[PDB]
RNA sequence: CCUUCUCAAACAUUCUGUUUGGUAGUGAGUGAUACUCUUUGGAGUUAACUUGAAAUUGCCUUAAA
């Protein structure tokens, strides 16, 4: 499409007028991590999606806390490959949507509210506490039966 | 304590009792379901109540469904306190008119015009707005 | 597990059809009865979608004329309403990829308004009619032992001579005549014939075929058009182009 | 594999590009090394012609699809029109199993079997995933033969076809052949000789033989789509017939099959409706 | 018909009432009520009958609106086909000579994408004073633009004919829009007996005009629908009985 | 996770006019008179302002697996 758009502008712009300004505004999602972090703190970004996975991990640990401090409505969507697909990459890590068509304005606002109710209400707790207490099943059998059988003759 | 009765607000157009029943049955078989509707004009006021049979199946069907984004709505569902109960909520049909009249004879209701005309000319004088005829 | 999105969608989608068919029926009652004070349009219209596509209109004013009706799956997420579903079981259309000939008349036309979104219609040609009846077309027939209700393809003409003796119709080519001419009987020949199991333009679910389905759905959505109008023109299309794919 | 990625991202227009930008295999080198060349190919083209005329007839399904059949119809209706124009039909033999012909295409003689056009039938024991490869091979083989036969005659290949004619019958009268006395005696039978074939008879095996033994045809079967000035003969096969014209001759299509095998022209006092026949006899 | 002296004595004394020593703009606004046997039975009408008048009320509105907060605005709804052809400058060319303006022009798509959602739909439409709509689009509207518009007599859409026979013409739009503007007054017909009209305000026009305005509307409306009595007022007031007819009523039993 | 009735005649030639018909809708809340009816059973209209699609009980199947 980019290639097509370059050819179209040359035919219109030289002959009549304009600085490429004839072409309409582009609305699209913002995929680069550095760019989105830069979009946050302005603060211009209405939604951020953060992939749960990512091999460094340290890369994206700060982003939930940073979004909270700035007050961007963040989410943690499952899978980085999914984010990739919407943005024409193999993997995207984060995706933020900064602008919206007037028709699409209503839908965006209500999604953010859903995310706050669905994510933000229950996850004051999530900041707190330590995951991964869980034991393997052979060890679970051993703890339960020892504890249970000791109590009851 | 919480009851088996359940309160569903924020319902899309074409979420009616047939559908609510057919959906929420899949959690567990239910005693009664009722939607609030307008009289005037037979269509939904976007909230209803169900009541199950078990207590614990109702609060599960609350827990899954409490901020469920659906059309341009999100469904909010509450479980009531003990008792409360589904009281009323009659399923209104659309109300068609009918031209019930006119029993009185023409020579009577002509004199109602002639009298109730002369009411108005006296009435407007009391305001007061001085006027002939 | 049904999900609330589909069950709310189907209620909305059906309610549009139940809204629609009432507007069709109330119009046609006043047209048929003739007490015409207040209606939308005076007479019927037929629209010819063909190859940016050209879109002519004519009023019908019959004059009987040949049509060939095919289901067409659609639209998406609607349960059939009984005033439609009744008519499809009279014309024997039910189950998709299934064709039949019908005689268009002023009396019949108002049916085609109702089944419009569930079928696709148009004028056939004699090569297409010839192609259908001697690639496909299958008789229900009884006699000589056996349980009886049995489907055999049109090989023999003696069977046609026997079961259409009284009309004076002999062999398959006179069936093709009597369909094409719009002559006497017709209906007896068309009930005798039994409706044509056509093949799906695209079966698949491989990555080559999914493309062809995607490119179909655009073309099908472009051709077939759901006005919901009461005074919606019935859509006709190049079946000669279609039955290249379907036969 | 790269299309599945395009769909399984979606991302459709990249798959629509991938559809266009690809180069399908074709067997052209493998034809011309397996048959070098034209007398060797015209030996084995016998075997091709049966299956194309088989697959032309049978109805479109899964395991087949329409395009393979609509190839075979066109490739066969090309082959008929060459044989009809250039007039090579020496032996005819109707059977229960369709109709056998024989044709002497530059030296060697070629037998081949057209089925009757009747709507039947797919058994679903037989493997199509073999036989379609044989069809794909023989479709390309007969393309290269028809290319050579048309240009050497010497008409243009491939021949264009009139649509408004095709919508009457769809057959041999459609296709029209055009440029850049015969071997005898069968060609130029039925010259100055005009047939009016009736509705009931099979048009698909009669018009072929009457055109390929050069004479004019009018069909009743054509008329339903919508002169009888110059018509001599009327082919008809009904029990009773009413009313018949004094100038016109009335015969049964047996006459046409019996005439070609001898190549004499028999008497038309024999045959005729509603009479019993002399038998038929193969020429083999 | 009415004698004009009976209108003049009423409507001038209505100036003596309305003066004295939102609310200010509501209180001064005139109406004319008219009663009859029964309008369009068993069937609601979302039409507007365009009644013939000598003087406009919209041209008087435009001048008085410039002072007020509410701000006068005209709207045109058109087909999906038409907005490709029509532009702002083409309307701006011809409409300035006789002297009106179209504020915006809207696609039938834009209601079913950009001004769906009801906050946005109300916030859009409650601006505009005169809505106009293409003959073909009209009948699709009350699903699209929705009910809160039709509750008023202002924001309900008026029909206008774009097409000359056949397919679009600019002149037929741009000459007819004048007729629906300045020559003609909108009013919707309900069920039942009653029918008010938004006649005008009182800042707008003169009492010399208003009687000539009323006299043509009375002569229009008597002949159509067989009427009982007519009742002019301003907003607060008790009604002024200016016409009153018995010979209608003797038909009403004769049906039953 | 569906997507909304996007023209129809008749007369007359004004480079398109004139006349007639075709439009069921979000729910909730607030308030200020008038008119038509029937007999208290209050039914039908009506000068508009607030509102995030807001809310608590007015008694057919190859669109598969």
Q: How many domains does chain A have?
A: 1
Tell me if C193 sits within 8 A of C136, measured CB to CB: no
d(CA E200, CA E233): 11
Whole-number Å distance, CA E134 to C1' F28? 33
Closest CA to C87 of C67, C59, C109: C109
d(CA C21, CA C82): 10
Query: And the tokens for C215?
Result: 């490119």
Structure-token match 């097409």, residue found: E163
Q: Is the peptide bond before D81 cis (omega within 30 degrees of 0)?
A: no
Query: And the tokens for A76?
Result: 């943690």
Tell me if E142 sits within 8 A of E157, measured CB to CB: no
Burial class (CB in 10 A: 0-12, 13-18, 19+), A49: buried
d(CA D199, CA D178): 30
- Write out the H or E segment, with its range, that includes residue E48: none
The angle subtended at Cα B100 by Cα B95 and Cα B101, nearest 5°, is 160
d(CA C38, CA C27): 10
Give the Å distances, CA to CA, from A95 to A53, A78, E2: 14, 12, 74
Nearest CA in chain A to E115: A103
Residue A72, C-beta contacts closer than 8 angstroms, at least 6 positions apart: A40, A43, A45, A46, A47, A48
Q: Is residue A67 part of a domain?
A: yes
Nucleic chain F contacts, protein chain E, residues 184-243, CB cut-off 7 A: 188, 190-196, 198, 228-229, 231, 235-236, 238-239
The alpha carbon of C108 is separated from its chain's Cα centroid by a whole number of angstroms, namely 13
Q: Is residue A150 part of a domain?
A: no
Q: Is residue A144 part of a domain?
A: no
d(CA A134, CA C164): 81
Tell me if A93 sits within 8 A of A33, measured CB to CB: yes
E201 to chain B, closest Cα gap in Å: 20
CB contact under 8 A, A88 and D10: no
d(CA E117, CA E120): 6
Query: How many C-beta atoms surround the C-beta of residue C48 within 10 A?
Result: 17
Residue E9, C-beta contacts closer than 8 angstroms, at least 6 positions apart: B131, B132
Kindly report each contact of residues D13-17 with a partner whose C-beta sits within 8 Å and lies 24 or more positions away, as own/partner.
D15/C211, D16/C211
CB contact under 8 A, C12 and B14: yes
Query: And the tokens for A103?
Result: 């028709």
Closest CA to C223 of C31, C52, C38: C52
Determine phi and psi for E158, rounding to 5 degrees: -95, 140
For residue D9, the chain A residues in CB contact (below 8 A) are 85, 88
Domain span at C161:
1-247
Over the Cα atoms of chain A, what is R_g?
24
Torsion angle defined by CA atoms of residues C29, C32, C33 and C37, in that order, rounded to the nearest 10 degrees: 80
Question: E31 forms bridges with which residues in the sheet?
Answer: E233
Tell me if D266 sits within 8 A of D258, measured CB to CB: yes
Q: Is residue A32 part of a domain?
A: yes
CB contact under 8 A, A110 and B67: no
Query: How many C-beta atoms surround the C-beta of residue E35 within 10 A?
Result: 16
Q: Residue E195 has what DSSP assignment? A: E
d(CA E101, CA E18): 32
d(CA C234, CA D5): 41
Whole-number Å distance, CA E164 to C1' F13? 13
For residue A107, the chain B residues in CB contact (below 8 A) are 72
Q: Is residue A148 part of a domain?
A: no
User: Mutation test of the interface with chain B: which of E118, E151, E244, E251, choosing the one with the most B Cβ atoms within 10 A?
Assistant: E244
Query: And the tokens for E2?
Result: 């009415």
Helix, strand or coil, per DSSP, at residue B57:
helix
Closest CA to D239 of E67, C168, C183: C168
**Chain F positions with any atom < 7 A from a protein CB:** 1-9, 12, 15-18, 21-28, 32-39, 43-64
Tell me if C247 sits within 8 A of C131, measured CB to CB: yes
Helix, strand or coil, per DSSP, at residue A49:
strand
Instruction: Give the CATH number for residue A12.
Output: 3.30.1330.30
The angle subtended at Cα D135 by Cα D155 and Cα C126, nearest 5°, is 65
Helix, strand or coil, per DSSP, at residue A105:
helix
Q: How many domains does chain C have?
A: 1
> In the β-sheet with B2-9, what is the strand arrangement from edge to edge?
B32-37, B44-51, B2-9, B73-81, B68-70
Query: Does C105 contact strand F, using a CB cutoff of 7 Å?
Result: no
Closest CA to D63 of C203, A59, C165: C203
d(CA C32, CA B45): 40
d(CA E57, CA B51): 59
C54 vs B: CB within 8 A = no
Tell me if C137 sits within 8 A of C154, measured CB to CB: yes
d(CA D116, CA D98): 5
User: After which residues are there C–N gaps above 2.5 Å in chain E?
Assistant: 21
d(CA D33, CA A27): 59
d(CA E5, CA E1): 12
Q: Residue A144 has what DSSP assignment? A: H
Pairing label, strands C45-50, C54-59: antiparallel
**H/E/C letters for each residue in C26-94?**
HHHHHHHHCCCCCCCCCCCEEEEEECCCEEEEEECCCCCEEEEEEECCCCCCCCCCHHHHHHHHHCCCC
Determine phi and psi for C134, rounding to 5 degrees: -125, 15
Tell me if B49 sits within 8 A of B103, measured CB to CB: no
- D39-77 b/e (C-beta count within 10 Å ≥ 16 → b): eebbeebeebbbbbbbbbbbbbbeebbbeebebbbbbbb
Whole-number Å distance, CA B52 to C1' F53? 28
Closest CA to B50 of B39, B42, B40, B60: B60
Please provide the DSSP assignment of chain C as one string.
Answer: ---HHHHHHHHHHHHHHHHHHHHHHHHHHHHHHT--SS-S-SS-EEEEEE---EEEEEE-----EEEEEEE---SSS-PPPHHHHHHHHHTT--SSSEEEEEEE-TTTHHHHHHHTTT-BB----HHHHHHHHHHS-EEEE--SSS-S-EEEES--SHHHHHHTTTTT--HHHHHHHHHHHT-SS-HHHHHHH--EE---S----SHHHHHHHHHHHHHHHHH------SSPPEEEE-HHHHHHHH-
Q: Is residue A85 part of a domain?
A: yes
Nucleic chain F contacts, protein chain E, residues 62-91, CB cut-off 7 A: 79-80
Q: Is the peptide bond before A69 cis (omega within 30 degrees of 0)?
A: no
Domain span at A116:
1-136
Query: How many C-beta atoms surround the C-beta of residue D279 within 10 A?
Result: 6
Q: Is residue A55 part of a domain?
A: yes
Pairing label, strands E227-233, E31-39: antiparallel
Q: Is residue A147 part of a domain?
A: no
Residue ranges of alpha helices (H) inside chain A are 2-13, 33-39, 58-70, 80-86, 102-115, 124-127, 137-151
Whole-number Å distance, CA C39 to C1' F7? 12
Dmax (CA) for chain A in angstroms is 97
Residues in chain E: 256
Question: A95 forms bridges with which residues in the sheet?
Answer: A49
Measured from Cα to the C1' atom, the residue closest to F56 is: B7
> In the β-sheet with D216-219, what is the strand arrangement from edge to edge?
D216-219, D194-197, D233-235, D249-251
Query: How many C-beta atoms surround the C-beta of residue C119 within 10 A?
Result: 25
Q: Residue E131 has what DSSP assignment? A: E
Tell me if C43 sits within 8 A of C30, measured CB to CB: no
Helix, strand or coil, per DSSP, at residue B2:
strand
Query: How many C-beta atoms surround the C-beta of residue D254 within 10 A?
Result: 19
Dmax (CA) for chain C in angstroms is 62
Q: With left for phi above 0 and alpha for psi between -120 and 50, is residue C64 left, alpha or beta?
A: beta
Pairing label, strands E104-107, E74-78: parallel
Residue B37, C-beta contacts closer than 8 angstroms, at least 6 positions apart: B43, B44, B45, B89, B90, B91, B92
**H/E/C letters for each residue in chain D?**
CHHHHHHHHCCHHHHHHHHHCCCCCCCHHHHHHHCCCHHHHHHHHHHHHHHHHHHHHCCCCCCCCHHHHHHHHHHHHHHHHHHHHHCCCCEEEECCCCEEEEEECCCCEEEEEECCCCCCCCCCCCCHHHHHHHHHHHHHHHHHHHHHHHHHHCECCCCCCCHHHHCCCCCCCCCCCCECCCCCCCECECCCCEEEECCCCCCCCCHHHHHHCCCEEEECCCHHHCCCCCCCEEECCCCCCCCCCCCCEEECCHHHHHHHHHCCCCCCCCCCCCCCCCCCCCCC
d(CA B124, CA E238): 6
Structure-token match 């259409």, residue found: C164
d(CA E234, CA E19): 11
d(CA B16, CA B70): 14
Nearest CA in chain B to C16: B14
Structure-token match 């014309």, residue found: C91
Give the Å distances, CA to CA, from D116 to D46, E150, E200: 19, 70, 85
């Amino acid at each position: 499409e980019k290639k097509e758009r370059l050819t179209k502008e040359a035919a219109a712009v030289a002959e009549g007028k304009s600085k490429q300004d004839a072409s309409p505004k582009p609305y699209a999602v913002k995929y680069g991590l550095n760019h989105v972090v830069a979009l946050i703190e302005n603060k211009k970004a209405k939604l951020v999606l953060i992939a749960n996975d990512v091999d460094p991990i340290e890369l994206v640990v700060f982003l939930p806390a940073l979004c909270k401090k700035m007050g961007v409505p963040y989410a943690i969507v499952k899978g980085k490959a999914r984010l990739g697909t919407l943005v024409n990459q193999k993997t995207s890590a984060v995706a933020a949507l900064t602008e919206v068509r007037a028709e699409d304005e209503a839908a965006l606002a209500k999604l953010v509210s859903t995310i706050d109710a669905n994510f933000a209400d229950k996850y004051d707790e999530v900041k707190k506490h330590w995951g991964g207490g869980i034991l393997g099943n052979k060890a679970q059998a051993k703890m339960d039966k020892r504890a249970k059988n000791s109590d009851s003759a | 304590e919480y009851s088996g009765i359940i309160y569903v607000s924020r319902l899309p157009h074409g979420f009616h009792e047939k559908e609510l029943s057919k959906y929420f049955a899949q959690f567990g078989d239910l005693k009664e379901v009722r939607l609030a509707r307008n009289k005037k004009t037979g269509n939904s006021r976007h909230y209803g109540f169900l009541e199950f049979v078990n207590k614990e199946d109702a609060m599960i069907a609350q827990e899954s469904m409490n901020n469920y984004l659906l059309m341009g709505h999100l469904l909010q569902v509450r479980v009531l306190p003990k008792g409360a109960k589904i009281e009323k909520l009659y399923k209104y049909k659309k109300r068609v008119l009918v031209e019930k009249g006119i029993t009185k004879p023409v020579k009577q209701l002509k004199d109602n015009m002639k009298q109730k005309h002369e009411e108005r000319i006296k009435k407007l004088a009391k305001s007061g707005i001085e006027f002939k005829w | 597990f049904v999900r609330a999105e589909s069950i709310v969608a189907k209620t909305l989608a059906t309610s549009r059809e139940k809204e629609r068919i009432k507007r069709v029926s109330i119009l046609e009652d006043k047209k048929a009865k003739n007490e015409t004070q207040h209606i939308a349009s005076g007479k019927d219209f037929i629209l010819k979608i063909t190859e940016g596509l050209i879109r002519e209109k004519t009023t019908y004013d019959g004059k009987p004329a040949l049509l060939f009706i095919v289901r067409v799956r659609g639209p998406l997420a609607v349960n059939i309403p009984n005033k439609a579903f009744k008519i499809l079981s009279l014309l024997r259309l039910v189950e998709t990829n299934t064709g039949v000939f019908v005689k268009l008349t002023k009396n019949v036309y108002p049916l085609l308004k109702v089944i419009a979104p569930y079928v696709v219609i148009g004028k056939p040609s004699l090569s297409s009619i010839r192609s259908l009846i001697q690639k496909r077309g299958r008789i229900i027939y009884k006699g000589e032992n056996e349980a009886e209700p049995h489907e055999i393809v049109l090989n023999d003409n003696n069977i046609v001579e026997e079961q259409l003796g009284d009309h004076g119709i002999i062999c398959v080519e006179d069936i093709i005549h009597e369909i094409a001419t719009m002559g006497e009987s017709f209906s007896v020949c068309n009930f005798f014939l039994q409706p044509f199991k056509l093949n799906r333009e695209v079966s698949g679910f491989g990555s080559l075929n999914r493309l062809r389905k995607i490119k179909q759905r655009e073309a099908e959505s472009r051709t077939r058009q759901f006005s919901n109008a009461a005074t919606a023109p019935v859509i006709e299309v190049d079946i000669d182009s279609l039955l290249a794919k379907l036969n | 594999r790269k299309l599945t990625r395009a769909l399984g991202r979606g991302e459709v227009s990249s798959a629509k590009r991938l559809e266009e930008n690809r180069d399908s295999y074709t067997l052209d080198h493998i034809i011309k090394e397996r048959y070098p060349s034209f007398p060797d190919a015209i030996r084995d083209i016998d075997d091709a012609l049966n299956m194309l005329f088989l697959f032309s007839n049978l109805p479109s399904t899964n395991q087949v699809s329409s395009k393979i059949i609509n190839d075979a119809q066109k490739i066969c209706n090309q082959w008929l029109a060459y044989v009809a124009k250039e007039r090579l039909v020496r032996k005819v033999f109707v059977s229960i199993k369709g109709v056998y012909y024989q044709a002497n295409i530059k030296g060697e003689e070629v037998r081949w079997l057209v089925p009757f056009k009747f709507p039947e039938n797919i058994p679903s024991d037989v493997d199509f995933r073999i036989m379609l490869t044989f069809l794909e091979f023989y479709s390309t083989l007969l393309h290269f033969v028809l290319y050579k036969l048309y240009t050497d005659s010497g008409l243009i290949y491939p021949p264009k076809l009139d649509l408004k004619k095709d919508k009457i019958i769809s057959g041999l009268s459609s296709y029209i052949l055009e440029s850049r006395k015969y071997d005898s005696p069968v060609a130029s039978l039925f010259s100055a000789f005009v047939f009016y074939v009736s509705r009931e008879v099979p048009i698909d095996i009669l018009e072929f033989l009457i055109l390929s033994c050069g004479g004019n045809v009018i069909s009743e079967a054509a008329m339903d789509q919508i002169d009888m000035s110059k018509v001599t003969h009327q082919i008809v096969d009904r029990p009773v017939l009413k009313n018949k014209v004094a100038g016109r001759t009335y015969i049964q299509p047996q006459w046409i099959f019996d005439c070609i095998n001898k190549g004499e022209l028999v008497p038309a006092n024999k045959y005729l409706p509603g009479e019993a026949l002399p038998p038929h006899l193969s020429p083999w | 018909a009415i004698p004009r002296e009976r209108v003049i004595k009423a409507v001038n004394e209505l100036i003596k009432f309305t003066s004295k020593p939102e609310e200010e703009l509501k209180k001064d606004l005139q109406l004319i009520v008219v009663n009859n046997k029964s309008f369009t039975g068993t069937s609601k009408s979302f039409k507007l009958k365009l009644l013939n008048v000598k003087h406009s009320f919209y041209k008087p509105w435009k001048e008085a609106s410039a002072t007020a907060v509410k701000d006068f605005k005209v709207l045109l709804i058109l087909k999906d086909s038409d907005i490709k052809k029509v532009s702002e400058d083409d309307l701006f060319d011809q409409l300035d000579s006789e002297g009106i303006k179209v504020d915006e022009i809207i696609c039938g798509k834009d209601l079913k994408t950009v001004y769906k959602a009801y906050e946005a739909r109300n916030a859009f439409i409650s601006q505009f004073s005169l809505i106009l709509a293409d003959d073909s689009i009209v009948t699709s509207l009350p699903k699209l633009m929705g009910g809160k518009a039709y509750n008023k007599v202002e924001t309900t859409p008026i029909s206008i004919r774009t097409h000359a026979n056949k397919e679009f013409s600019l002149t037929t739009l741009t000459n007819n829009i004048k007729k629906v503007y300045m020559n003609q007054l909108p009013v919707k017909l309900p069920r039942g007996t009653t029918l008010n009209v938004h006649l005008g305000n009182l800042e707008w026009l003169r009492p010399e005009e208003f009687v000539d305005n009323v006299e043509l509307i009375s002569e229009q409306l008597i002949k159509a629908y067989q009427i009982r009595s007519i009742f002019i007022k301003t907003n607060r007031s008790p009604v002024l009985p200016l016409y009153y007819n018995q010979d209608v009523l003797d038909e009403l039993e004769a049906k039953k």
